[PDB]
């Protein structure tokens, strides 16, 4: 994954979303970078650097953590996505950015052909995200852990309308409840604590990788 000169293909985007690990230093009691390395070794297909709020690192310390997480992704051959921070994404030459409901059109203009993910909670937001230039949408919260839990209702609705945009499920996803997200039509699942707080992050990631592959084939 180098510097993109064209928008990512939907086929490739959908494969990357399979096991999408999201993490910040405040999401684990272990060493942050080590957890990311283990998640990647186990099978995570995409990683999102989300370092904000609470007791998250700030300033130069946060930037250095980002550099190390990015280096871990490079070694695993997995794309490195940054949450909300456009400047950081550009500065580090990240593979993309993920934003929540931020002006998507403005972000797309600022990042060229980098990967752009947009959190969507309604049909309109999904449609708008697509027209704004999003490469994928994150739908949820599917399960409980801010927004109202919606299960897989929106994922189903989007597919029923014939929309084929890459979709990743978000919100309280665990190895036990991930299958229905894929069965509903999602292209992958995203998780935080299911891997970040696991006693064995590598095995947890591997289990997700095996499970998701099986269900993507079976649905």
**What is the Cα–Cα distance from 137 to 185, expressed in whole angstroms?**
13
For the chain, give the secondary structure using H, E and C.
Answer: CCCCCCCCCHHHHHHHCCEEEEECHHHCCCCHHHHHHHHHHHCCCEEEECCCCCCCCCHHHHHHHHHHHHHHHHHHCCCEEEECCHHHHHHHCCCEEEECCCCHHHHHHHCCCCEEEEEECCHHHHHHHHHHCCCEEEECCCCCCCCCCCCCHHHHHHHHCCCCCCEEECCCCCCCCCHHHHHCCCCEEEECHHHHCCCCHHHHHHHHHHHHHHHHHCC
Q: Do 216 and 208 form a contact (C-beta atoms < 8 A)? A: no
**What is the Cα–Cα distance from 23 to 38, expressed in whole angstroms?**
12
Sign of CA dihedral 128, 160, 135, 39: positive
Closest by CA position to 175, among listed 210, 139, 217 = 210
Closest by CA position to 219, among listed 162, 192, 181 = 181
In the PDB record, what is the listed experimental method?
X-ray
Exposure on the CB side of residue 30, measured as CA atoms within 13 A = 16
1-219 placed in CATH 3.40.50.300: no
- Token couple for 190: 């995203």
Chain Cα centroid distance, residue 56: 19
């Amino acid at each position: 994954h180098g510097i993109r000169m064209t928008r990512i293909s939907r086929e490739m985007m959908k494969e990357l979303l399979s096991v999408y690990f999201i993490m910040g230093s405040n999401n684990t009691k272990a060493d942050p970078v080590t957890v990311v390395q283990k998640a990647l070794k186990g099978g995570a297909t995409l990683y999102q650097f989300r370092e904000k709020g609470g007791d998250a690192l700030t300033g130069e310390a946060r930037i250095k953590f980002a550099e190390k997480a990015q280096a871990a992704c490079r070694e695993a051959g997995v794309p490195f996505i940054v949450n909300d921070d456009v400047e950081l994404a550009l500065n580090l030459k990240a593979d993309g950015i993920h934003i929540g409901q931020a002006n998507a059109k403005e972000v797309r203009a600022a990042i060229g052909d980098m990967i752009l993910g947009v959190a969507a909670h309604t049909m309109s937001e999904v449609k708008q995200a697509e027209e704004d230039g999003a490469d994928y949408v994150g739908l949820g919260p599917i399960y409980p852990t801010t927004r109202a839990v919606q299960g897989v209702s929106l994922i189903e609705a989007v597919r029923r309308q014939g929309i084929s945009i890459p979709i990743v499920g978000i919100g309280g996803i665990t190895i036990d409840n991930a299958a229905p997200v894929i069965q509903a039509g999602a292209d992958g699942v995203s998780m935080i604590s299911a891997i970040s707080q696991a006693e064995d992050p590598e095995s947890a990631a591997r289990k997700f990788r095996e499970e998701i592959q099986t269900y993507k084939t079976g649905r």
